[PDB]
A paper describes a structure:
[name] is a ThiJ/DJ-1 family protein from P. aeruginosa that was previously incorrectly annotated as a protease.
The structure was refined to 1.4 Å resolution with an Rcryst of 0.254 and an Rfree of 0.274. Each [name] protomer comprised an α/β sandwich containing eight β-strands and eight α-helices. [name] and its close structural homolog, PH1704 (a protein with proven proteolytic activity from Pyrococcus horikoshii, and which shares 43% amino acid identity (E = 5.2 × 10–38) with [name]), both possess a “nucleophile elbow”; a distinctive strand–nucleophile–helix motif and a common characteristic of the “α/β hydrolase” protein fold. In [name], the nucleophile elbow is comprised of residues 108-118. The nucleophile itself, Cys112, forms part of a constellation of putative catalytic residues, which includes His113, Glu22, and Asp86 from the adjacent protomer. The X-ray crystal structure of [name] was similar to that of YhbO, a well-characterized glyoxalase from Escherichia coli.
Residue numbers in the entry:
A (entry chain X), B (entry chain B): 2 to 179
Write the structure that this text describes.
């Protein structure tokens, strides 16, 4: 079984993130030996959601403003339409995603989460999947939208919905290990 | 002031629409003498939301499947991130908006509601505003995004947020009268 001991992943979330899109990948990554930190726009706690109902609050380990991608081997971008619509316009979240591309570090994204990638200018020429509502936005941004349980372009790992999470986790672990 | 007597407006909404972006314009049009029909994807009731909480239920006058634009002088597209994300993929909602473009009928859209126009191919070469989170999607789809309280491009009337509603209402009434 692949070990990710020593690996640190940053999950980028604002209030309204799909809770399982963080906790599923977080548990799979922790089971393999990695550390996962939660970064948000504000300090304190960030609220996850189960579909259209608010769910549990999670302790924020750090802010986008304060984060350095030197400290992380990869980014996790959970969906949640509310979180995804909010986070995509945040300059420091965009900067983290841009720095990950420049540094050839994995970015795992799921559901509505690729809006951050569109707005950071990062989907042009890349193949990814997403929740189908984002298909037009990704294609209009220059992306190559495909319908796959888990898409991979280099170290860009993408999935469309919560049911994809098990395969998403397995592929993200393979890509993080290299 | 301006009478809209004899005019009929279809508001296209799904569950999770921003309630005031329906009720505010609806009252203004009705005060002006117009009739406002609430159309949804499903019969019965459609759930309005107040920001991030579901709110009151509204009677559905007709479904997108059954609707003809022959019976409406204009479309009203309230926002709400949940509604706007859902409604954009429904071909029958896209059809109603395309028929509006083809028949030179006003379309008033606010906040997140322009996602449907993007997916219907209707923002190409158009000038419009929106909630800023859609800026990149509107520009990537060939639109010209502007930051105005109420933007107008022909009969396309667009606003950004609930505080724009009074001006949105006043402009819509003007465009509807012609």
């Amino acid at each position: 079984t692949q070990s990710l001991h020593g690996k640190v992943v940053a999950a980028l979330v604002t209030d309204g993130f799909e809770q399982v899109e963080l906790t599923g990948p977080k548990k799979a990554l922790e089971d393999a030996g990695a550390t996962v930190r939660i970064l948000s726009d504000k300090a304190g706690e960030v609220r996850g959601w189960n579909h259209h109902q608010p769910a549990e609050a999670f302790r924020v380990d750090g802010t986008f403003e304060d984060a350095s991608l030197d400290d992380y081997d990869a980014l996790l971008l959970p969906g949640g339409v509310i979180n995804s619509d909010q986070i995509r316009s945040l300059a420091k979240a965009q900067e983290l995603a841009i720095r990950a591309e420049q540094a050839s570090k994995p970015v795992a994204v799921i559901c509505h989460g690729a809006w951050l990638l569109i707005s950071a200018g990062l989907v042009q020429g890349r193949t990814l999947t997403s929740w189908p509502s984002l298909k037009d936005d990704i294609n209009n941004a220059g992306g190559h939208w495909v319908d796959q349980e888990v898409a991979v372009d280099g170290k860009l790992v993408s999935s469309r919905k919560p049911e994809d999470i098990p395969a998403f986790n397995r592929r993200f672990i393979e890509i993080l290990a290299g």
